[PDB]
Scaffold this active site. Sequence first.
Site, short mmCIF file in Angstrom:
data_model
loop_
_atom_site.label_atom_id
_atom_site.label_comp_id
_atom_site.label_asym_id
_atom_site.label_seq_id
_atom_site.Cartn_x
_atom_site.Cartn_y
_atom_site.Cartn_z
N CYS A 241 3.67 1.57 9.25
CA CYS A 241 3.57 0.47 8.29
C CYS A 241 4.92 0.06 7.80
CB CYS A 241 2.65 0.86 7.14
SG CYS A 241 1.04 1.43 7.70
N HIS B 49 0.81 -1.21 0.00
CA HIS B 49 0.00 0.00 0.00
C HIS B 49 0.85 1.27 0.00
CE1 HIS B 49 -0.02 -0.11 4.48
NE2 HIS B 49 0.10 1.21 4.32
N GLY C 147 2.21 5.78 9.50
CA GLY C 147 3.61 5.81 9.13
C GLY C 147 4.41 4.65 9.71
#
Lengths: 304, 304
Positions: free
Chosen positions: A145, A41, A143
């Site tokens: 991730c 993503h 953030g």
Amino acid sequence: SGFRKMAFPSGKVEGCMVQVTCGTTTLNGLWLDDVVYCPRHVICTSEDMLNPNYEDLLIRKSNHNFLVQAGNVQLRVIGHSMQNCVLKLKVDTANPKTPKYKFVRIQPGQTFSVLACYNGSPSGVYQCAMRPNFTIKGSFLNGSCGSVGFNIDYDCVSFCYMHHMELPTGVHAGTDLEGNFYGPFVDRQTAQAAGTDTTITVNVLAWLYAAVINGDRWFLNRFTTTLNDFNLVAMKYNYEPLTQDHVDILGPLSAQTGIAVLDMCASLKELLQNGMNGRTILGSALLEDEFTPFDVVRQCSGVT
Amino acid sequence: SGFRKMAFPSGKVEGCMVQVTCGTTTLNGLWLDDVVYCPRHVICTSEDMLNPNYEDLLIRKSNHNFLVQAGNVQLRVIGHSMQNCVLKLKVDTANPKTPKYKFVRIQPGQTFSVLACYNGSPSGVYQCAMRPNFTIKGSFLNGSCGSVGFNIDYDCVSFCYMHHMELPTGVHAGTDLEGNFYGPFVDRQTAQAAGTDTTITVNVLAWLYAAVINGDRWFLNRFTTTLNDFNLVAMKYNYEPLTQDHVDILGPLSAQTGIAVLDMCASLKELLQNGMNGRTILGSALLEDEFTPFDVVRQCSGVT
Ligand SMILES: Cn1cncc1NC(=O)Cc1cccc(Cl)c1
Ligand SMILES: Cn1cncc1NC(=O)Cc1cccc(Cl)c1
């Protein structure tokens, strides 16, 4: 003595963290050898996240659109591919800090350490368990991730988790390092059922053994139980049914303390039925299930 | 979202750990620049520990009696000196992995991360608080001596603690990096009073603010209190009296949530007087005091 929710030393993993930017999105990547792994993503905008067509979104991206920065060193991307929910960015330089490593898919109820990162920079480390429902109760902000979960056996880092998302319920979901989600989750901004969670019985029993080793013994009683009887109580209290495989893995702790596994089950049964009566066990006022039997042995023997 | 007892990433400190052996005793040392710091009791045997004369014991030791090994690299000792309860072993090689660092003496109620080590090898990392009575409730076994506590501000490691001993009560005591014990403790195998401990009020309030930020709000009420009234309750429940300096450090959390510090005090007063009624706050069934207001802000903003 003393018993703490201890994480593995994070140094070997800190050496692998990089920042990955694609378009306007920045997240963390893991640089091992000449590959950087990150959540797919990173290629989405916020409009894209309600139902992204990842294959089409990735087709609009070229190697030069993936900005990878290791601290202040810019990495040159020479290939990209999507494997399940992860992207693999081939870079022209092998990470000189690549530790010995494995990619593993952990089982629900197992524990691991998380190195929470933002913009490729480590912020902190904590230990947690993969819930029976395949979620993790972490500490992750936007953030984070691409932050990873891992275990260490001597000099080998077994990476087991990459963080992808926070469900609307505030619990966390992610994948193994091949990009397969743990649980039924999808990388889309949609409300998603996590499903019924349970308490990890074998871990609570391990932690009761850790308590006896470390001096907390008030919960020991004159009773015993059977697996059948204990499992009726486990059912009522939303605990995982205990099996002989769980009793077997508790063997070393049972041998060390001299407390038979079914006798510890009777202490757990009484705690479930009566509560803690305002007392604590190893500084906790609830029954802790984030320590496996291996974690208790490792911590109680001083494994490096 | 989510709130975890998070430790600082340990990599910068792992690079400083060495093993120090003197005679039959092995413990951990910290190698910064060309000096290795370790507890002075590395020079004792078990007969010596009931009342060691450290000055006389050290006089029988020469530089070549201190075996310092950094992984598998042997360090050459060219000087030794005792400073309070630490030894400083001058070595001929500066540690190439020396991070930017400071030695600080922390205040009671402050938090730090511990990298627990055995034989110079890191085993795990955990966060804890220096109790108001100057003890720490750690996880330390024999051989963990010389493990250090620290905080990190960007690229600077502030070392605040070196582990020395476990009191007969199972709690831990140690020194700053100049070898001064925190608290009344001495490095002798004698029973030693730790003195009355209290709960760190400002940290509990910070953690209540972390709970509101992260969705747990059931404990908020329609009440307020004063510092005087709250401190009468703090007295009864063995909590540190709250001061205006504590209210001031809670200012950023009060501003972020819109909950006045004295209104949060009234929630804490009700929790102290009524208990949790079988509920939890941030996964805990007791009032947590191991997060400072700075820790809550750092964790809630994603500081790297
Ligand atoms: C808030 N947060 C905490 N940990 C991760 C995040 N970020 C997200 O959840 C962003 C996001 C939204 C929908 C789907 C996916 Cl895969 C990712
Ligand atoms: C068991 N343990 C846990 N953490 C440290 C230890 N080791 C000790 O307490 C050994 C020891 C005994 C008396 C005085 C001193 Cl300074 C040191």
